[PDB]
């Protein structure tokens, strides 16, 4: 099995004692620089907590996926079976941070990456920590 294609997913710690391997990892996340980051808030709640539009505005004109953009869809399921060699890679947990962009051509409110020339801002993306760990059972294991 190969999960090297996880450039936006770090901390792949997985247990292989049982046939269905138990995989856990922390996904890249997008935050909001107004009051905090609550993944369990929907688009309407984030919009209310930020204040870029109103609840009467159509959903098409609102910011789709603000402060809750989880591009890594939880954790893909590894089918149970026998494992001989595993191909590792390099994965990171990306911090996404954007501000409000007022697009007049569509009267919409979208996300804009911070600009260093506009006063003092934060980098558009960064990596928190860089580490991965695997536990292999009492069989023939190969890691690369």
From TrEMBL:
Protein name: Lymphostatin
Organism of origin: Escherichia coli
Gene designation: lifA
């Amino acid at each position: 099995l190969d999960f090297s294609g996880n450039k936006v997913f770090g901390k792949m710690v997985l247990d292989l004692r049982q046939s269905p391997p138990l995989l856990h990892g922390e996904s890249s996340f997008n935050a909001d620089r107004k009051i905090g980051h609550r993944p369990d808030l929907g688009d309407w709640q984030i919009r209310e907590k930020v204040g870029y539009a109103n609840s009467i505005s159509p959903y098409s004109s609102l910011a789709h996926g603000y402060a809750n953009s989880k591009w890594p869809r939880t954790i893909p399921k590894i089918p149970s079976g026998e494992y001989d060699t595993i191909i590792l890679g390099y994965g990171h947990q990306y911090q996404a941070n954007t501000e409000i962009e007022y697009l007049s051509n569509w009267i919409v409110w979208r996300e804009a990456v911070p600009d260093s020339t506009s006063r003092h801002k934060r980098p558009p993306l960064e990596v928190l920590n860089s580490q991965c760990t695997v536990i292999a059972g009492e069989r023939k294991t190969t890691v690369l």
